[PDB]
Design a protein around this motif. Structure first.
Motif, PDB file in Angstrom:
ATOM      1  N   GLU A   1       4.491  50.676 -44.346  1.00 50.46           N
ATOM      2  CA  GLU A   1       5.510  51.349 -43.536  1.00 50.46           C
ATOM      3  C   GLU A   1       6.971  50.790 -43.645  1.00 50.46           C
ATOM      4  O   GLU A   1       7.776  50.839 -42.745  1.00 50.46           O
ATOM      5  CB  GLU A   1       5.013  51.513 -42.100  1.00 50.46           C
ATOM      6  CG  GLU A   1       3.795  52.469 -42.014  1.00 50.46           C
ATOM      7  CD  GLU A   1       4.226  53.879 -41.838  1.00 50.46           C
ATOM      8  OE1 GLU A   1       4.583  54.372 -40.701  1.00 50.46           O
ATOM      9  OE2 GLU A   1       4.187  54.515 -42.944  1.00 50.46           O
ATOM     10  N   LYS A   2       7.331  50.228 -44.786  1.00 48.72           N
ATOM     11  CA  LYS A   2       8.661  49.702 -44.991  1.00 48.72           C
ATOM     12  C   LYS A   2       9.063  50.122 -46.419  1.00 48.72           C
ATOM     13  O   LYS A   2       8.213  50.234 -47.366  1.00 48.72           O
ATOM     14  CB  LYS A   2       8.758  48.169 -44.824  1.00 48.72           C
ATOM     15  CG  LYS A   2       8.150  47.484 -43.560  1.00 48.72           C
ATOM     16  CD  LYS A   2       8.766  46.068 -43.304  1.00 48.72           C
ATOM     17  CE  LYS A   2       7.884  44.853 -42.916  1.00 48.72           C
ATOM     18  NZ  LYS A   2       8.563  43.506 -42.957  1.00 48.72           N
ATOM     19  N   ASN A   3      10.344  50.312 -46.635  1.00 45.85           N
ATOM     20  CA  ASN A   3      10.727  50.716 -48.002  1.00 45.85           C
ATOM     21  C   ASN A   3      11.105  49.486 -48.838  1.00 45.85           C
ATOM     22  O   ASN A   3      12.257  49.341 -49.299  1.00 45.85           O
ATOM     23  CB  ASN A   3      11.902  51.746 -47.945  1.00 45.85           C
ATOM     24  CG  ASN A   3      13.033  51.145 -47.078  1.00 45.85           C
ATOM     25  OD1 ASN A   3      12.767  50.522 -46.042  1.00 45.85           O
ATOM     26  ND2 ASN A   3      14.262  51.384 -47.489  1.00 45.85           N
ATOM     27  N   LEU A   4      10.088  48.612 -48.991  1.00 46.54           N
ATOM     28  CA  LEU A   4      10.183  47.307 -49.715  1.00 46.54           C
ATOM     29  C   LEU A   4       8.978  47.090 -50.613  1.00 46.54           C
ATOM     30  O   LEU A   4       7.844  47.183 -50.113  1.00 46.54           O
ATOM     31  CB  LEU A   4      10.156  46.116 -48.714  1.00 46.54           C
ATOM     32  CG  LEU A   4      11.463  45.909 -47.930  1.00 46.54           C
ATOM     33  CD1 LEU A   4      11.203  44.952 -46.757  1.00 46.54           C
ATOM     34  CD2 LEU A   4      12.613  45.417 -48.863  1.00 46.54           C
ATOM     35  N   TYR A   5       9.287  46.802 -51.908  1.00 50.72           N
ATOM     36  CA  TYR A   5       8.217  46.660 -52.892  1.00 50.72           C
ATOM     37  C   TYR A   5       8.406  45.372 -53.652  1.00 50.72           C
ATOM     38  O   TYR A   5       9.524  45.001 -53.972  1.00 50.72           O
ATOM     39  CB  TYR A   5       8.330  47.822 -53.962  1.00 50.72           C
ATOM     40  CG  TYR A   5       7.860  49.091 -53.351  1.00 50.72           C
ATOM     41  CD1 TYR A   5       8.694  49.864 -52.525  1.00 50.72           C
ATOM     42  CD2 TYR A   5       6.506  49.437 -53.491  1.00 50.72           C
ATOM     43  CE1 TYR A   5       8.218  51.002 -51.865  1.00 50.72           C
ATOM     44  CE2 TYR A   5       6.027  50.609 -52.885  1.00 50.72           C
ATOM     45  CZ  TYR A   5       6.895  51.386 -52.108  1.00 50.72           C
ATOM     46  OH  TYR A   5       6.409  52.503 -51.500  1.00 50.72           O
ATOM     47  N   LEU A   6       7.321  44.711 -53.988  1.00 49.00           N
ATOM     48  CA  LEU A   6       7.397  43.538 -54.874  1.00 49.00           C
ATOM     49  C   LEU A   6       7.789  44.138 -56.243  1.00 49.00           C
ATOM     50  O   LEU A   6       7.330  45.205 -56.731  1.00 49.00           O
ATOM     51  CB  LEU A   6       5.980  42.928 -55.044  1.00 49.00           C
ATOM     52  CG  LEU A   6       5.629  42.179 -53.786  1.00 49.00           C
ATOM     53  CD1 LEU A   6       4.260  41.493 -53.970  1.00 49.00           C
ATOM     54  CD2 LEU A   6       6.738  41.188 -53.426  1.00 49.00           C
TER      55      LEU A   6
ATOM     56  N   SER B   1      14.427  46.823 -52.095  1.00 44.51           N
ATOM     57  CA  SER B   1      14.526  48.009 -51.211  1.00 44.51           C
ATOM     58  C   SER B   1      14.574  49.303 -52.030  1.00 44.51           C
ATOM     59  O   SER B   1      15.121  49.335 -53.139  1.00 44.51           O
ATOM     60  CB  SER B   1      15.780  47.973 -50.315  1.00 44.51           C
ATOM     61  OG  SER B   1      15.959  46.726 -49.588  1.00 44.51           O
ATOM     62  N   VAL B   2      14.003  50.391 -51.528  1.00 48.03           N
ATOM     63  CA  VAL B   2      14.045  51.646 -52.251  1.00 48.03           C
ATOM     64  C   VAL B   2      14.331  52.770 -51.238  1.00 48.03           C
ATOM     65  O   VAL B   2      14.321  52.535 -50.012  1.00 48.03           O
ATOM     66  CB  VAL B   2      12.697  51.970 -52.973  1.00 48.03           C
ATOM     67  CG1 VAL B   2      12.366  50.873 -54.014  1.00 48.03           C
ATOM     68  CG2 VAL B   2      11.564  52.156 -51.904  1.00 48.03           C
ATOM     69  N   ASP B   3      14.551  53.988 -51.815  1.00 45.46           N
ATOM     70  CA  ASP B   3      14.812  55.189 -51.010  1.00 45.46           C
ATOM     71  C   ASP B   3      13.537  55.644 -50.355  1.00 45.46           C
ATOM     72  O   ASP B   3      12.625  56.089 -51.035  1.00 45.46           O
ATOM     73  CB  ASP B   3      15.391  56.271 -51.858  1.00 45.46           C
ATOM     74  CG  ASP B   3      15.929  57.310 -50.978  1.00 45.46           C
ATOM     75  OD1 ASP B   3      15.354  57.699 -49.975  1.00 45.46           O
ATOM     76  OD2 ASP B   3      17.058  57.771 -51.443  1.00 45.46           O
ATOM     77  N   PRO B   4      13.497  55.511 -49.012  1.00 47.42           N
ATOM     78  CA  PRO B   4      12.249  55.828 -48.308  1.00 47.42           C
ATOM     79  C   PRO B   4      11.863  57.246 -48.468  1.00 47.42           C
ATOM     80  O   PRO B   4      10.685  57.454 -48.245  1.00 47.42           O
ATOM     81  CB  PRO B   4      12.402  55.430 -46.848  1.00 47.42           C
ATOM     82  CG  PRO B   4      13.905  55.679 -46.652  1.00 47.42           C
ATOM     83  CD  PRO B   4      14.568  55.268 -47.976  1.00 47.42           C
ATOM     84  N   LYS B   5      12.797  58.142 -48.857  1.00 47.63           N
ATOM     85  CA  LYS B   5      12.391  59.531 -49.076  1.00 47.63           C
ATOM     86  C   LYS B   5      11.550  59.742 -50.385  1.00 47.63           C
ATOM     87  O   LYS B   5      10.736  60.682 -50.536  1.00 47.63           O
ATOM     88  CB  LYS B   5      13.618  60.382 -49.052  1.00 47.63           C
ATOM     89  CG  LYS B   5      14.265  60.600 -50.431  1.00 47.63           C
ATOM     90  CD  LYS B   5      15.530  61.509 -50.527  1.00 47.63           C
ATOM     91  CE  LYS B   5      16.819  60.777 -51.008  1.00 47.63           C
ATOM     92  NZ  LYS B   5      18.019  61.571 -51.405  1.00 47.63           N
ATOM     93  N   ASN B   6      11.664  58.842 -51.358  1.00 47.59           N
ATOM     94  CA  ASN B   6      11.011  59.042 -52.602  1.00 47.59           C
ATOM     95  C   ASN B   6       9.819  58.163 -52.936  1.00 47.59           C
ATOM     96  O   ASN B   6       9.354  58.282 -54.087  1.00 47.59           O
ATOM     97  CB  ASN B   6      12.069  58.628 -53.603  1.00 47.59           C
ATOM     98  CG  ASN B   6      13.126  59.700 -53.548  1.00 47.59           C
ATOM     99  OD1 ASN B   6      12.855  60.816 -53.157  1.00 47.59           O
ATOM    100  ND2 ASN B   6      14.299  59.402 -54.004  1.00 47.59           N
TER     101      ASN B   6
END
Length: 152
Positions: free
Chosen positions: A64-69, A84-89
């Motif tokens: 539930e966060k727009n954060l990826y390793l 961080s990334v675009d939570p819409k995509n």
């Protein structure tokens, strides 16, 4: 349909849990009891890429966060970071290479090798409360084996 994902937590083979260390890093430590509420929960997505029986391409986002390793060169070195990334995509089936890890099952343990940097792996130190990082081997003193736990 959309990309499939599973909620889960990871521990290293020394049974250390993973927690946040600031906003763009994770650290590994021995946790039990109340304190384990501190652990990070991931959303593991099954993404596009070269696959085999025991080698499965995945993305690791924080649930539930727009954060990826992700694995990128930093000062000329393969390095692990939380991007961080675009939570819409996200997530998506076709994740960018930097986000992809080959989840490999070996001897009852899991390894997370960077799809982008062969033989570089998610690693932890033996010492307590040190950062989780990208290590240049599955050999050595550092820890490159993990277990996964399923979360509701």
């Amino acid at each position: 349909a959309p990309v499939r994902s599973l909620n889960c937590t990871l521990r290293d083979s020394q049974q250390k849990s993973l927690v946040m260390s600031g906003p763009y890093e994770l650290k590994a430590l021995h946790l039990q009891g109340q304190d384990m509420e501190q652990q990070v929960v991931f959303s593991m997505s099954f993404v596009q890429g070269e696959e085999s029986n025991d080698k499965i391409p995945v993305a690791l986002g924080l649930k539930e966060k727009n954060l990826y390793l992700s694995c990128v060169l930093k000062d000329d070195k393969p390095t692990l970071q939380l991007e961080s990334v675009d939570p819409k995509n996200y997530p998506k089936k076709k994740m960018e290479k930097r986000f992809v890890f080959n989840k490999i099952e070996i001897n009852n343990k899991l390894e997370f090798e960077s799809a982008q940097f062969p033989n570089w792996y998610i690693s932890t130190s033996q010492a307590e409360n040190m950062p989780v990082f990208l290590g240049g081997t599955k050999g050595g003193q550092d820890i490159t084996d993990f277990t996964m736990q399923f979360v509701s």
